[model samples]
Target: DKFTYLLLQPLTEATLSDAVNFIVEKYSAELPDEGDASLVVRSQLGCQFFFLVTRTLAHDQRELAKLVQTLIPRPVRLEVFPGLQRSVFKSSVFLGHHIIQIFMGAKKPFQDWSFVGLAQDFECPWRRLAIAELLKKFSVSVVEKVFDNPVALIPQHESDNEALIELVTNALRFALWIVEFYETETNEKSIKELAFLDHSSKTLLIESFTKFLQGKDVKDQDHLKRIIDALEKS
Candidate 1:
């Protein structure tokens, strides 16, 4: 929680120091009195995704983006979002296709969890599981919907379609997890009250939901909604 890792870049050793300095200057006020700020750099050639992790005292997402913009390479999109709230600031830079997601928050807030630690404990693994569950859910739902309304010709069911349903589901799952994780990790609310399903339970629910979607006799929206309600209660 004491700014364990000041910065992490996926860049080379030569540029690593510079990256650290760049982050430090941008977030010098947020750093602790202890150890020198650290930075981790990484590079992926085949894949378009790039990730940068750092601890800062900055909280404003837009300001954090502007700080990292100068140090990071061009064409590698950068965006930031809030991590665990801390007294100081912490952030991660995600370079996405056509966009960058920068996650920013405090270094050490009233909460015991650090952004880096929470990322390690929850975000990363949760994302992987969420993605898998989402795909499985979307795939089954689209197929079932297509079969149920054969004449409707759901565009997303087309084999050549860009997996739009899967993408949308993944995005939704990701957002939900982010909100739920923050609430739990920050102790803003109890886990039970949050009412979020774990990875395994979510997968199970998805499976059930997929089967429900395939029911040939259940045609009404209210019926489907009732089924989903039962599934949620279960």
Candidate 2:
């Protein structure tokens, strides 16, 4: 009973008053009238919780996650606790804050650039299509695993390498399609709809790519250059 009682403490701590205050402070700039708003803070697991209470459900959640990610940082160590319910049995227990101080820009550090270059080099339309189909089936799993425990993305086994490669290949293919389509159509809506090309999407895509490229020899500059040139031409 203590475990059950302790499990619900996070939700109890997140009272209506606390939620109102959180909404006022965080979203007041965007939403002036916080009195009309309703908030909900649900625990994904014991102490790990997600706050959701804003103007639009989809937009607000995405924005909130991004904002929290920036303010709280990521690559956090999430604690896992066993439970009875299948869904809540294993959940992310937020340990503490992790300050992710990595540089962000179009031109990232050379090490990061190389991985993107590799993905571009290995890009194939058919292979990418296959990966896309596979991802559709496993996207939720990928998201959960990456969010819950990111270290698994790295190529620990032969199968891991294959899976990672497929993910990256699909991502690079999708990115090229978006860029090309945007060039001719010039429709902002179309561009926005291409989720893979979006900054956040690209980060996740590239993260999978980098994991696959790890342990490979980067000295093959000529080969990498050839692939980069081909990708650009295509």
Candidate 3:
């Protein structure tokens, strides 16, 4: 009800890309010198919150915002405005891009630990809808319980090595779940956000993951490989 446009589903790869391109192209045509446009996309439960930063003033920017409103077909709530002060705008744009970087699909989420709060907000069970008024949301706490101490969830009677294996297996399971959760049938698919655990930690985790999978069955080889490959890269 808060949004002017209500999206029945999530935004597709083409739609996101086209929407961005349309705004940039239109903005650039009017002002050649100002191409420094920043976009922040916040996806929440069948709605998108777009924060667009531009070089023009609000009076002129309002027209562009209205143009964007008409151009985009998906369910979106837009906040289009001009840039602020130097450091303010710089840091804001920097943070904004990093926040949505995971959805860009090229990089791994949580590569930079500067914004740990990002994971705290959007981690597992965050966007998943529930009917009950009182419900639990999984975020940093779950990741800590699972990844920070890999053997934490294991039974007391289990052997240390066995516990380690089980823990890594669950980590992989979570990773696979994340991929599936973020996946769309679009040609331009966004990357899944695997919060916490930097590159080195993920490397070791994936190593254990490979061992665990190979130790057992190879039924889901493709899925295993996808997570591994994504983690291996940035």
Candidate 4:
């Protein structure tokens, strides 16, 4: 094991030396059985985790198959012998990494934005899953969600790219107008999807009572603008 850790339960300072001492002084009895090789484990946070895995000797090259399984989250380790070779058994177990990190930011950080915590939401720990997941997470993209309570910036995935920007910018008051379009199905689908209306859903609604005023007026086509203004001010 090149690295070692002490399970920081409630949470406390634990170091590699501490992990090593705990194993050497405490469980030294198991060393004869655990000859060499090691295992690498990951962290609960969006971080890389490792352990002081293996060791060897003189003219003899000590090789071991260590399978890791454990009850602890922080400072934990284990080994299993698949072939069951050696004087005893030769094997090791290292759990495959599962990324459950969530991104709450619109654009990626310098590289990517990731959130890790107790909820242990099993989604994208990297950038891929969050992208696919964001596409279908209709509510999260909605005006209400942004103007509503939310992680508003993220649905910005492809929209931030050069390709879709101008195309939708000209069409919708704000590219976000469609966020809820798919979600609305029929509810308010036609209502806000065309947030192209100034401040009201009534695009060109006739405000005049006089015949001289004529039919509906042009909606100025700034619907999303006003909603966003309110959201920013609030």
TM-score of candidate 3 on Cα atoms, chains taken together: 0.25
lDDT of candidate 4 at residue 98, scale 0 to 100 = 12
Where does candidate 2 stray beyond 4 Å?
A: 1-123, 134-138, 142-189, 194-234
Candidate 1 displacement at residue 233 in angstroms: 3.4
| lDDT for each residue of candidate 2 in 78-155, tens digit (9 for 90 to 100) | 211112111211111000000010111222123432343423423444433433332222223333322232323222
Name the candidate that leads on lDDT.
Answer: 3
Question: What residue runs in model 4 are displaced by over 4 Å at the alpha carbon?
Answer: 1-16, 33-98, 103-234
The lDDT of each candidate is 0.30, 0.29, 0.31, 0.23
Q: What's the distance in Å from true for residue 221, model 2?
A: 17
What's the lDDT for residue 109 in model 1?
19
Off by over 4 Å in 1: 1-116, 119-168, 171-175, 184-201, 205-234
* Tens digit of per-residue lDDT, candidate 1, span 1-234: 112122222233333345435433434333333343311111111010111221111111333322443444332222111122111112222211001111111121121123233233333554434433322332243333321123111212446333433343333343334424442332324333325434444444435334534532333323334434443443
lDDT of 3 by residue, 1-234 (tens): 212121111334333345455444433343434333422111111111132221111112223322433453332222222112211222222223322222222233222212333222223343222100001111122233321123221124235544433343344334334334432312123233544444555666466445434533343444446556656653
> What lDDT is reached at residue 169 by model 3?
34
TM-scores for every predicted model? 0.20, 0.21, 0.25, 0.17
- Output the worst ten-in-a-row residue range by lDDT, candidate 3: 130-139
Per-residue lDDT, model 2, residue 94, is 8
